Amino acid sequence: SGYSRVLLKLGGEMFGGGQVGLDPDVVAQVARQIADVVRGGVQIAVVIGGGNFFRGAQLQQLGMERTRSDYMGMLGTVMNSLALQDFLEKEGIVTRVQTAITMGQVAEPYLPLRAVRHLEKGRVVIFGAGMGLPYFSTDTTAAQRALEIGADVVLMAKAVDGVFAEDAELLTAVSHREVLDRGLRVADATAFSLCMDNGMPILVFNLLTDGNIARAVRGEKIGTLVTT
Amino acid sequence: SGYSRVLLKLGGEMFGGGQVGLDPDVVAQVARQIADVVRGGVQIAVVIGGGNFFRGAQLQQLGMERTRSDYMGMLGTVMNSLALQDFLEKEGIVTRVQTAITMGQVAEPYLPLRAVRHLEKGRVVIFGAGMGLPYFSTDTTAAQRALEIGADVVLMAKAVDGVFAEDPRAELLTAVSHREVLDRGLRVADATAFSLCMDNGMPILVFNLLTDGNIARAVRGEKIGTLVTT
Amino acid sequence: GYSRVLLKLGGEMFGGGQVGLDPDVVAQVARQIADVVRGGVQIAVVIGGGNFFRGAQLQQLGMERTRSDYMGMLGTVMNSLALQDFLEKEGIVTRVQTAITMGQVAEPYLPLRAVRHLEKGRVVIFGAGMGLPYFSTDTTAAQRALEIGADVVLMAKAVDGVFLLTAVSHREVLDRGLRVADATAFSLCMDNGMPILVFNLLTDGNIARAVRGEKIGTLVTT
Amino acid sequence: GYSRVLLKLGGEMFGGGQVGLDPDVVAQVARQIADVVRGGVQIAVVIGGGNFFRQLQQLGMERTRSDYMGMLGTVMNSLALQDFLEKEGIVTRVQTAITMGQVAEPYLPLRAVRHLEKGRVVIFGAGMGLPYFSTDTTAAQRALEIGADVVLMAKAVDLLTAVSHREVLDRGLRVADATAFSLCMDNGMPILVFNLLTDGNIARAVRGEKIGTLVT
Amino acid sequence: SGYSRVLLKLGGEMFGGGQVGLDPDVVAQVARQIADVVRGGVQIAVVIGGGNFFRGAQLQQLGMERTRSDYMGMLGTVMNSLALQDFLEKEGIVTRVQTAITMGQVAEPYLPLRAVRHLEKGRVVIFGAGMGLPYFSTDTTAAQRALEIGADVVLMAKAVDGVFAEAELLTAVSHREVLDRGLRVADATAFSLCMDNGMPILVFNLLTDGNIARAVRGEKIGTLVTT
Amino acid sequence: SGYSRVLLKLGGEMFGGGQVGLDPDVVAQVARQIADVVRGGVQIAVVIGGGNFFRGAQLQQLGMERTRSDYMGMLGTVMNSLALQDFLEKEGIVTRVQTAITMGQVAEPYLPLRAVRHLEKGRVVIFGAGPYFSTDTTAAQRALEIGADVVLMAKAVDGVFAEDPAELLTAVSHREVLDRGLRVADATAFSLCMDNGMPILVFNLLTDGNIARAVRGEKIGTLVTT
Ligand SMILES: O=c1ccn([C@@H]2O[C@H](COP(=O)(O)OP(=O)(O)OP(=O)(O)O)[C@@H](O)[C@H]2O)c(=O)[nH]1
Ligand SMILES: O=c1ccn([C@@H]2O[C@H](COP(=O)(O)OP(=O)(O)OP(=O)(O)O)[C@@H](O)[C@H]2O)c(=O)[nH]1
Ligand SMILES: O=c1ccn([C@@H]2O[C@H](COP(=O)(O)OP(=O)(O)OP(=O)(O)O)[C@@H](O)[C@H]2O)c(=O)[nH]1
Ligand SMILES: O=c1ccn([C@@H]2O[C@H](COP(=O)(O)OP(=O)(O)OP(=O)(O)O)[C@@H](O)[C@H]2O)c(=O)[nH]1
Ligand SMILES: O=c1ccn([C@@H]2O[C@H](COP(=O)(O)OP(=O)(O)O)[C@@H](O)[C@H]2O)c(=O)[nH]1
Ligand SMILES: O=c1ccn([C@@H]2O[C@H](COP(=O)(O)OP(=O)(O)O)[C@@H](O)[C@H]2O)c(=O)[nH]1
Ligand SMILES: O=c1ccn([C@@H]2O[C@H](COP(=O)(O)OP(=O)(O)O)[C@@H](O)[C@H]2O)c(=O)[nH]1
Ligand SMILES: O=c1ccn([C@@H]2O[C@H](COP(=O)(O)OP(=O)(O)O)[C@@H](O)[C@H]2O)c(=O)[nH]1
């Protein structure tokens, strides 16, 4: 039972708390939760999203170029990354932040072999700037990094308990292909492909209800498990 | 009578519109008013603030560490820089962005000799990431950059007409000495920004940027706003 | 006709159906890229690397895929430096950016600079794919095309088009099941409406005729 | 016997006779490294890349750019070795003379020694980091910088059982590239030419047994 | 009492020994003194001044451009930084030099997260090139580098015992009181940066053998500025 | 003669001129002599040493690691280079500082194809830096790479004497210096020129108006040519 190495995707919702900017009362709750599961010995890499600031396709619909707006939005997710790092630090947790856009003064660059040893060294690894590339999502970054750093599962942390059938019975266990056949919102379509095609399982759970991610990695039947 | 090269300081309210985030109505209007001055033949670099995302000092008081919160603030500065770049592109203006924190993929690093040479080429240089270091401000950034690139004056763009003896609810000042600002307690900039310009004789001009046509006035030498000098 | 183009070169176009480098192939490629820079087209090109290793074929031989994807990606810099040399001997100015930073071998990926190079009449070569495992070169050419703001993706093959449909909608190739490029890359093209033109490069003057706007190959367009 | 060894592997040791990569050859090359590691000797490996060429110097490429492609090819050989070692249960550390970060650790010699002392096998890819250098010279140089006891020139061929640096130069015997050989003869490194591919012959070699040809 | 992580300002006086250029006797003495406090267990980062070569404002007075002169003067600090690295290495002390103006192969760029990690590994971080920007001092660079790397105090290493009142050496002043008495501690702008963030400043005679380990243990030597 | 593009080599100890450090009174006149040349119409590239920021055999004896000791010298050349850039600009001369080690913020990297592009545009280019080589050698190599017609070794003696402690010789051949044992430049520097035909002109720099006579093709100093 259990997952030894996980990749946790935090949306911008987990930083802004719904609205724009930063909600310290959420990042605190967010950090107390990660810390509870690191003390259990799980190696946990965190991929940071950035919708509490900008989203590239949102700003392009307004008139801004998309490329320039995708960089704008990856830069927001570094700001979340520095903020998760501070709150995890007040929790006693050692952090290592890695950005896909290299910014030496601010974080070490993307080096996957070192990111894997940080974990083994018991450090929490924070991937910022997503994948570094415009026309991609942080959902897809979580799929990508999770496959490269040898994660056992991608933990899609949400503010509701799992995947329902419309917005309504919540279903606990589904095939990857079962999700697409029932037209379900599990992640990016692009992200889901990279996972399904490579057999990477995904767990959609309510990270904010107390002590749920620790339940998750112990193997308990928590949330929704997408597995092939 | 006339400034040849200028350094304009845009606070975060020129991107957030008073509020946290990005109000595209304001950058569009600021981008419109910069293009008007570029076609007039002024060389203009732009130091960009980030009040509309994070200030390190206020997050420090919420409990966050100052240095991490200051980096968050400088990262927000490049987000405003890229946004000014976009709107300034839609006005048909050629821009080079430079980040004090080095980010090859996003913008060329801070190289000051190339900066003044883009200006000579007719381009607008946008100075992102502040000074690249915590425990500083973009007001002080403007003071330093203006000095390093040989700007004739620091343009402190505000949304009011200038400095007034006493807040609001009426008496505006046209021309002040540097020591006049100090002896009277007027707020023109950071204590450090101002000291950096006063000690090196850089003039500061505080003016209402948002009234259509006014920056282009200020640069042609018009007696607009508030000029602190000598 | 097209102002900025992103041409995708597979390991076919360096190794030639065998393994390694067949310099008669590479030289003809350079010969044809040469033709279009004289034409006034801004061309950036993405280099694939199946004449050495493919990450998913080595993964089936036994090897770990991550480690093998990097092997594949270095393969493309070898192909990338090869094109550089021959295009130079055709008299063309090149500049090679790698998605995996190597400093001394080539400049890193600076996309705003890749585009000032095009504007200056130079040919930008995009090596090391996207610099990430679990991706293909076809996906790279879509991403790189949208980022440098190219008008169309030239999918260079050695057959002339796909089968010979001369113009097809983005949704019509999903509905008939024709093959144009990787499914991950095509969907990133369809979803952003980036056109893809599949054409025989190896016939003389074909690509020069493609950027000219001529009915050539198979054009996928919504 | 020998305590620390530098092993030079030609392109031949990766593609076999022909071009590209041969899993059989690489697998038996690693099987041989493994029972050596297990034997207690610290072993660092310099990797060549002749399996990615033929015609190279008949196309006219430059040598600067040419030499860099070869150097890139050695890093593909290193990653490949590292994989087949890993399946044999051997911990490795690939270093490159050309900084790459994302692919591999840079070349620091102090930190390579650290790795050997910690029981890991160091693979040196990208050669010397510069054009106009061979691999025989990278081997001669890195054997020196990490303090190896001997350079092991792994050939595919099996008779002189001992010559010396001052003895060979009188005969038409090429044991390695003349720039590499002139570095070893000048600094007192021995050179052992042997058949790596006869089963368990490198284990006998570092034990001190009469194998192949030793140059002192 | 004692300081657990410290930042040490060495002016040009501490390499040129007074005259211009470099004086190995002075530098050796300075490395001896740093080395024996690193074994004490102190994490120590050093900011290197440059008056034994160039000072921006002084070349400015001779006609030269300030901006260019400031850069001249910054490269002077790297020259000193390499000397201090050298003498400390010959004392068997692991050093790491980070330079504000990045040169790559001469030293590593400014990476502050990694500077505190060097200190935690027991290494001596040397801060060359000041802050990298014209129109600043290395006194301000120490005040800045000390706040960001988290140091407990700034050690203004002088050749005199401490801050005087023109005899009369002062053992402990408050920040506000230095400005009110017009005492000369550091820079004007360097002191403000310190005063405004509550960063203490100990001014002491580094040259008298054993004074810095003395200072670090928390003994009352020199002049301590605190609020 | 009539030299159209020249590589001027100055020993660093010239700028410190009398002591250690920098004597602005000397680099000032060096700048204004170089201006007369370019406003005359000659293209001029400059290499400067570092010997003024050290006391003679300072770090030869100090025990310093030679790689680190060399980097200290390269930094001093750049300090010397910026100081020249400044007075040459007050002389009204566009200048460009190129550094062998990339120092983006301080100057521009070394690209020789761009370096002649500067001289063609009436600008002076200044070469800093160059481990384990002397600035004599770098002057030899820059001069070759930028197509210079001649390497002007500006030294503090009138030329090359036959005996040394005589008569200063005015014209020698490349094979003649190696054979007679004459002090022209570093051995590696000299072999770089003699193996590539590159002529070398040794002349005293402290006497004013001499740089101008070198380029003009006055028969001054010692001309070494094969
Ligand atoms: O490291 C870098 C350097 C530059 N850039 C960005 O690339 C763009 C082109 O920068 P370039 O250096 O390629 O040319 P230039 O237009 O700036 O100047 P000149 O050719 O006239 O000499 C500029 O917008 C720059 O900000 C990066 O994104 N990263
Ligand atoms: O990386 C660099 C490159 C260049 N520079 C410095 O910036 C200044 C101008 O930078 P540029 O390279 O863009 O123009 P240029 O004067 O050299 O020549 P043209 O393109 O107009 O033909 C030059 O003085 C150069 O030394 C840097 O400081 N850092
Ligand atoms: O820049 C780098 C440095 C290191 N690495 C790679 O990261 C992996 C481990 O990275 P580390 O350097 O952090 O740990 P280590 O196991 O190799 O050494 P110690 O903990 O004992 O001190 C190694 O396989 C290395 O090659 C990179 O990929 N890039
Ligand atoms: O380029 C860089 C490299 C590193 N760092 C940051 O410096 C800090 C020090 O990270 P280090 O690489 O210096 O050592 P470490 O913490 O990983 O400890 P060991 O593996 O050796 O056991 C890290 O937190 C990193 O994010 C940067 O800011 N920029
Ligand atoms: O590889 C990446 C990662 C992020 N982004 C941009 O940065 C934004 C960050 O938001 P994100 O979409 O990642 O996710 P969310 O915050 O909703 O989880 C994206 O939306 C894109 O606009 C991008 O362009 N490429
Ligand atoms: O050199 C600099 C420039 C800016 N900042 C950061 O910039 C943030 C906000 O900028 P600023 O206060 O200037 O914004 P404005 O109010 O002018 O919009 C602060 O919290 C600082 O951390 C910094 O730390 N160093
Ligand atoms: O972003 C990239 C680009 C390439 N590759 C690897 O490099 C190989 C290059 O193969 P590709 O399909 O691109 O080459 P082609 O057949 O088009 O020549 C891929 O298969 C992967 O193994 C990768 O992992 N990521
Ligand atoms: O951030 C910095 C650091 C140094 N300097 C320049 O380098 C000189 C070094 O002076 P410093 O006071 O630091 O040396 P000290 O006097 O302390 O010996 C300064 O005067 C400036 O000319 C600078 O401009 N910015």
Side-chain angles (χ1 to χ4, degrees), chain A residues 1-166 168 170-228, chain B residues 1-165 167-168 170 172-222 224-230, chain C residues 1-175 177 179-214 216-222, chain D residues 1-53 60-156 162 167-168 170-173 175-209 211-216, chain E, chain F residues 1-54 56-57 59 61 63-166 169-172 174 176-182 184-226:
Chain A
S1 266
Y3 311 102
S4 37
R5 184 179 301 166
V6 302
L7 199 134
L8 170 84
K9 204 257 159 182
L10 306 191
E13 40 151 332
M14 301 281 143
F15 295 95
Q19 43 170 47
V20 164
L22 175 89
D23 189 344
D25 292 291
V26 200
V27 196
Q29 190 168 355
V30 153
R32 284 191 301 268
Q33 279 286 112
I34 305 164
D36 168 39
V37 70
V38 75
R39 300 203 196 93
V42 154
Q43 307 177 1
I44 187 185
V46 188
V47 166
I48 310 300
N52 56 297
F53 290 131
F54 298 121
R55 254 191 255 237
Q58 273 184 349
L59 287 178
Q60 129 191 111
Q61 282 206 221
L62 275 46
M64 311 194 71
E65 214 87 85
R66 207 222 175 120
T67 45
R68 180 142 46 213
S69 307
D70 274 339
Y71 286 118
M72 287 184 61
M74 285 158 43
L75 282 172
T77 83
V78 176
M79 285 155 63
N80 291 324
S81 294
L82 297 178
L84 188 53
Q85 164 162 81
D86 181 278
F87 275 105
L88 268 187
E89 170 158 315
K90 321 263 178 228
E91 220 76 31
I93 308 318
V94 192
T95 36
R96 287 286 176 294
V97 46
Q98 280 202 354
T99 53
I101 308 187
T102 88
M103 334 159 58
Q105 187 165 339
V106 170
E108 91 180 319
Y110 181 52
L111 311 113
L113 296 177
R114 293 214 42 173
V116 158
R117 267 285 285 172
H118 277 346
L119 313 192
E120 296 174 355
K121 289 197 175 123
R123 294 171 221 212
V124 173
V125 184
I126 305 178
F127 288 120
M131 264 174 43
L133 289 164
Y135 293 86
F136 279 100
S137 71
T138 299
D139 279 350
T140 292
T141 295
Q144 197 284 316
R145 299 282 133 98
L147 279 155
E148 188 165 21
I149 69 153
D152 308 306
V153 56
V154 182
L155 296 183
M156 287 304 298
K158 297 192 30 172
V160 279
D161 319 77
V163 169
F164 315 76
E166 299 303 75
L170 169 148
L171 290 175
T172 85
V174 284
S175 180
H176 277 95
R177 213 167 228 119
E178 182 174 340
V179 162
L180 296 204
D181 293 351
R182 299 149 90 99
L184 289 177
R185 189 70 47 207
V186 159
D188 258 31
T190 314
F192 208 71
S193 314
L194 197 77
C195 286
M196 186 197 297
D197 290 309
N198 297 267
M200 185 49 149
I202 319 152
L203 211 172
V204 174
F205 73 113
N206 184 345
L207 171 86
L208 296 189
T209 53
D210 210 16
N212 263 86
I213 187 186
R215 295 227 219 289
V217 317
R218 276 179 284 209
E220 313 198 10
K221 190 237 264 188
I222 194 77
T224 316
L225 187 73
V226 200
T227 172
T228 321
Chain B
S1 198
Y3 302 106
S4 158
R5 189 190 307 248
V6 300
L7 183 119
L8 173 76
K9 200 279 174 175
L10 304 176
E13 74 275 4
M14 308 283 183
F15 302 84
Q19 316 299 295
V20 47
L22 182 75
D23 185 302
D25 282 338
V26 201
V27 282
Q29 156 153 232
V30 307
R32 192 162 48 56
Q33 290 266 134
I34 295 190
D36 205 41
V37 82
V38 174
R39 314 191 192 107
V42 77
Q43 307 189 357
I44 192 178
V46 173
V47 167
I48 295 188
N52 51 310
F53 295 100
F54 300 103
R55 281 157 152 112
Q58 310 168 337
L59 295 187
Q60 177 194 36
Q61 205 210 324
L62 274 61
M64 305 202 99
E65 284 302 319
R66 179 51 174 275
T67 81
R68 256 195 290 279
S69 301
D70 275 21
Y71 278 112
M72 292 177 60
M74 301 189 248
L75 289 165
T77 280
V78 309
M79 299 172 79
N80 295 337
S81 296
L82 299 179
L84 184 52
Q85 172 163 249
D86 183 85
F87 284 78
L88 227 41
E89 194 206 66
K90 273 110 178 84
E91 299 289 310
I93 284 305
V94 186
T95 54
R96 307 269 165 279
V97 181
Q98 286 194 351
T99 42
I101 310 172
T102 282
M103 303 147 97
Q105 187 167 342
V106 187
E108 102 172 308
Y110 176 71
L111 314 147
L113 303 167
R114 283 219 105 211
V116 316
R117 174 90 186 150
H118 284 339
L119 304 191
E120 290 157 5
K121 287 188 157 108
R123 304 162 186 167
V124 183
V125 179
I126 285 175
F127 279 129
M131 282 191 182
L133 313 149
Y135 298 88
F136 286 102
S137 74
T138 64
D139 265 14
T140 291
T141 290
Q144 191 266 351
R145 298 299 206 232
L147 281 155
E148 180 161 21
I149 72 157
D152 297 312
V153 58
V154 179
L155 286 38
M156 297 286 308
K158 316 284 317 214
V160 280
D161 305 0
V163 288
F164 298 103
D167 252 43
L172 178 144
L173 294 85
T174 174
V176 285
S177 82
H178 278 90
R179 182 126 45 84
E180 210 153 330
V181 185
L182 294 182
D183 293 359
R184 196 217 283 244
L186 307 144
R187 335 219 151 53
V188 177
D190 265 43
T192 326
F194 187 90
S195 209
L196 188 47
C197 319
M198 181 183 199
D199 293 342
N200 296 107
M202 179 79 40
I204 314 130
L205 198 149
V206 177
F207 75 103
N208 185 335
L209 179 72
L210 292 168
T211 42
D212 194 298
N214 231 0
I215 177 158
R217 289 167 144 85
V219 55
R220 271 121 69 193
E222 269 82 332
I224 179 58
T226 279
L227 166 81
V228 47
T229 190
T230 292
Chain C
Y2 298 106
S3 322
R4 198 178 280 169
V5 85
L6 190 289
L7 170 80
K8 198 258 153 169
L9 289 189
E12 312 138 36
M13 239 50 74
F14 303 81
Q18 268 88 0
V19 166
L21 297 163
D22 182 299
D24 308 352
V25 188
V26 189
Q28 179 178 7
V29 166
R31 202 131 51 238
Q32 281 280 108
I33 308 164
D35 260 328
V36 316
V37 183
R38 283 92 185 238
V41 153
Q42 302 177 353
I43 182 175
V45 48
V46 172
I47 304 304
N51 46 324
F52 298 113
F53 307 116
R54 233 190 331 273
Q57 164 151 55
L58 285 179
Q59 176 201 49
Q60 294 204 45
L61 270 150
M63 307 197 34
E64 192 213 61
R65 171 138 172 209
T66 302
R67 196 141 30 201
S68 313
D69 275 355
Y70 277 108
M71 305 192 43
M73 293 194 247
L74 300 155
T76 64
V77 192
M78 313 208 303
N79 286 338
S80 295
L81 290 180
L83 193 74
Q84 178 167 43
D85 201 89
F86 277 98
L87 288 171
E88 285 235 305
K89 287 209 255 281
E90 288 291 292
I92 309 307
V93 199
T94 53
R95 250 142 189 80
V96 183
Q97 303 203 336
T98 54
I100 292 175
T101 302
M102 310 185 189
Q104 260 215 37
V105 195
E107 271 189 328
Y109 177 61
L110 311 157
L112 298 196
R113 213 207 196 78
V115 155
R116 185 91 185 107
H117 287 337
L118 306 171
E119 272 153 26
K120 291 204 207 161
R122 298 145 178 184
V123 186
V124 185
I125 294 154
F126 282 127
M130 303 208 290
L132 297 158
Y134 295 94
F135 283 108
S136 65
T137 275
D138 287 8
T139 302
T140 307
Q143 199 287 328
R144 290 286 141 92
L146 297 144
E147 174 141 23
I148 60 157
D151 301 309
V152 63
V153 177
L154 298 197
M155 206 65 49
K157 314 246 176 193
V159 190
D160 40 340
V162 60
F163 308 83
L164 200 290
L165 293 300
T166 37
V168 189
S169 92
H170 274 278
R171 185 121 217 153
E172 177 175 14
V173 48
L174 272 168
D175 287 354
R179 215 196 226 314
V180 47
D182 270 46
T184 326
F186 181 86
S187 170
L188 177 70
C189 285
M190 192 180 62
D191 289 349
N192 269 98
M194 158 80 39
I196 313 147
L197 170 65
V198 180
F199 71 94
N200 198 358
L201 183 83
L202 297 167
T203 49
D204 198 306
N206 246 30
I207 178 185
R209 292 169 171 275
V211 302
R212 252 139 75 180
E214 303 205 15
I216 273 284
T218 300
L219 213 172
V220 188
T221 186
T222 289
Chain D
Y2 302 117
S3 148
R4 208 198 299 279
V5 306
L6 193 127
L7 183 65
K8 186 251 161 192
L9 295 175
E12 43 148 30
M13 295 300 148
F14 290 94
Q18 295 213 340
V19 71
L21 185 128
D22 191 326
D24 286 347
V25 167
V26 187
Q28 106 172 91
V29 163
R31 243 95 99 342
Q32 297 286 297
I33 284 168
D35 79 328
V36 160
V37 186
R38 273 158 197 154
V41 51
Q42 297 160 10
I43 168 175
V45 196
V46 175
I47 294 301
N51 40 317
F52 297 114
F53 289 127
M61 236 174 60
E62 221 165 64
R63 208 219 186 150
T64 280
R65 203 171 280 154
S66 149
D67 282 333
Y68 273 111
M69 289 205 316
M71 280 161 55
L72 284 173
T74 69
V75 189
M76 301 162 74
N77 285 329
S78 315
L79 285 187
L81 184 63
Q82 156 171 119
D83 192 273
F84 279 86
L85 285 161
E86 205 196 55
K87 275 114 177 68
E88 291 288 298
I90 298 319
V91 190
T92 54
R93 289 289 176 283
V94 160
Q95 306 205 138
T96 60
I98 317 172
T99 324
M100 285 191 197
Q102 43 270 283
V103 189
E105 151 185 14
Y107 171 66
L108 301 86
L110 290 197
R111 152 158 262 147
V113 168
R114 213 49 192 106
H115 288 335
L116 299 151
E117 279 271 310
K118 280 207 188 79
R120 327 178 159 154
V121 173
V122 179
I123 306 98
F124 288 125
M128 278 270 269
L130 295 106
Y132 303 120
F133 284 121
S134 16
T135 287
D136 293 86
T137 308
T138 304
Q141 190 76 253
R142 296 193 168 166
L144 289 170
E145 303 169 271
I146 73 175
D149 296 312
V150 50
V151 175
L152 284 60
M153 293 291 299
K155 309 265 154 105
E167 317 193 284
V168 47
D170 298 59
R171 290 187 233 125
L173 272 293
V175 293
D177 285 2
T179 301
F181 180 79
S182 191
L183 206 31
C184 299
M185 167 164 191
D186 278 328
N187 298 283
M189 277 277 324
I191 303 177
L192 188 121
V193 199
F194 71 106
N195 201 344
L196 189 84
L197 305 142
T198 57
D199 199 342
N201 245 28
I202 177 185
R204 298 187 175 117
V206 279
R207 220 172 301 193
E209 315 205 350
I211 293 297
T213 325
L214 180 84
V215 168
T216 41
Chain E
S1 305
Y3 299 115
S4 211
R5 188 187 289 175
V6 85
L7 186 120
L8 175 76
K9 210 277 162 172
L10 304 169
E13 64 220 72
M14 297 280 174
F15 302 90
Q19 303 296 339
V20 152
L22 272 157
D23 183 1
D25 304 21
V26 186
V27 186
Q29 179 182 347
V30 177
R32 303 200 300 263
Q33 288 270 124
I34 287 140
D36 91 343
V37 317
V38 192
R39 324 193 174 285
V42 196
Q43 319 191 350
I44 183 151
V46 191
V47 164
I48 302 307
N52 50 318
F53 289 113
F54 297 132
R55 275 189 265 241
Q58 277 133 51
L59 285 170
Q60 182 169 10
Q61 307 208 17
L62 325 178
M64 305 185 67
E65 217 216 331
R66 166 62 162 278
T67 313
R68 247 193 299 284
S69 300
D70 275 349
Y71 279 108
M72 266 159 76
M74 270 158 174
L75 305 184
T77 67
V78 183
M79 300 220 279
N80 290 342
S81 292
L82 300 184
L84 189 45
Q85 174 171 81
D86 187 87
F87 276 88
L88 280 153
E89 291 213 315
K90 275 194 53 63
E91 317 287 353
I93 294 290
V94 193
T95 54
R96 288 282 178 285
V97 52
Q98 286 179 359
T99 196
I101 314 169
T102 86
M103 329 166 186
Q105 275 109 42
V106 174
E108 216 181 12
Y110 179 63
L111 309 141
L113 292 186
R114 203 198 271 273
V116 308
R117 186 59 185 148
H118 290 336
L119 298 168
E120 290 183 352
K121 288 200 181 127
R123 290 149 181 186
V124 171
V125 184
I126 311 200
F127 283 127
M131 291 196 273
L133 313 163
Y135 297 82
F136 284 101
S137 178
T138 299
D139 287 322
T140 318
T141 311
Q144 195 287 326
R145 289 292 145 78
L147 290 164
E148 168 163 40
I149 64 158
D152 302 300
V153 71
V154 190
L155 293 190
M156 292 280 132
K158 299 294 232 309
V160 295
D161 286 320
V163 186
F164 298 86
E166 43 173 66
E168 189 80 66
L169 168 78
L170 309 152
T171 325
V173 190
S174 82
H175 271 91
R176 181 58 55 180
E177 220 192 2
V178 173
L179 303 201
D180 279 347
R181 279 158 168 215
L183 315 172
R184 307 229 129 272
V185 196
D187 246 8
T189 69
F191 189 93
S192 311
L193 193 46
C194 286
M195 191 199 266
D196 292 329
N197 288 99
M199 173 64 69
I201 315 180
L202 196 137
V203 187
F204 71 115
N205 181 348
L206 181 86
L207 291 176
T208 46
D209 196 86
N211 251 27
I212 168 175
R214 266 201 234 265
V216 170
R217 304 174 214 150
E219 326 201 355
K220 49 146 50 184
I221 45 147
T223 297
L224 174 50
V225 193
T226 207
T227 41
Chain F
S1 284
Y3 297 114
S4 151
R5 164 183 316 177
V6 300
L7 192 285
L8 180 69
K9 195 278 182 174
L10 298 112
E13 69 268 357
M14 305 284 251
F15 283 14
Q19 276 140 32
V20 278
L22 206 88
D23 189 331
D25 266 287
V26 315
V27 65
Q29 157 151 43
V30 169
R32 195 254 313 131
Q33 293 204 29
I34 297 170
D36 278 58
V37 166
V38 288
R39 296 196 259 96
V42 192
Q43 302 169 27
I44 179 141
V46 187
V47 173
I48 301 205
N52 55 296
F53 293 118
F54 316 103
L59 42 80
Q61 55 142 12
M64 268 200 52
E65 184 192 65
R66 186 107 247 164
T67 169
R68 233 208 301 281
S69 158
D70 288 338
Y71 275 131
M72 291 197 54
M74 305 202 238
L75 286 174
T77 74
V78 179
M79 265 151 74
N80 275 340
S81 296
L82 298 161
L84 182 68
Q85 177 174 70
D86 178 278
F87 279 130
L88 266 169
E89 272 190 358
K90 277 176 228 301
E91 221 47 60
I93 308 304
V94 202
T95 37
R96 292 287 180 267
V97 180
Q98 292 208 337
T99 58
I101 194 42
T102 63
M103 244 178 260
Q105 195 175 335
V106 171
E108 50 185 284
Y110 174 77
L111 304 162
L113 295 171
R114 166 174 305 230
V116 293
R117 286 306 162 298
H118 288 337
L119 301 178
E120 278 177 9
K121 295 161 124 154
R123 317 180 157 125
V124 191
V125 78
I126 316 192
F127 296 119
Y132 293 106
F133 317 115
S134 82
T135 59
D136 274 324
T137 302
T138 56
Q141 200 304 100
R142 304 280 128 103
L144 285 155
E145 260 173 332
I146 71 168
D149 299 310
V150 74
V151 189
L152 306 180
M153 297 265 180
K155 281 199 291 195
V157 279
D158 291 4
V160 183
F161 313 101
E163 278 289 8
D164 63 81
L169 315 164
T170 37
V172 299
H174 265 132
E176 210 181 6
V177 178
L178 275 177
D179 201 43
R180 301 234 150 102
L182 311 160
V184 161
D186 263 13
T188 305
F190 187 75
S191 196
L192 245 184
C193 314
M194 173 207 184
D195 288 29
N196 286 98
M198 175 66 44
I200 318 184
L201 206 155
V202 180
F203 67 106
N204 198 308
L205 172 95
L206 256 65
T207 14
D208 167 74
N210 267 130
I211 307 172
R213 299 177 163 179
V215 293
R216 192 193 303 153
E218 216 163 282
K219 288 181 220 64
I220 298 208
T222 303
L223 181 93
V224 194
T225 180
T226 175

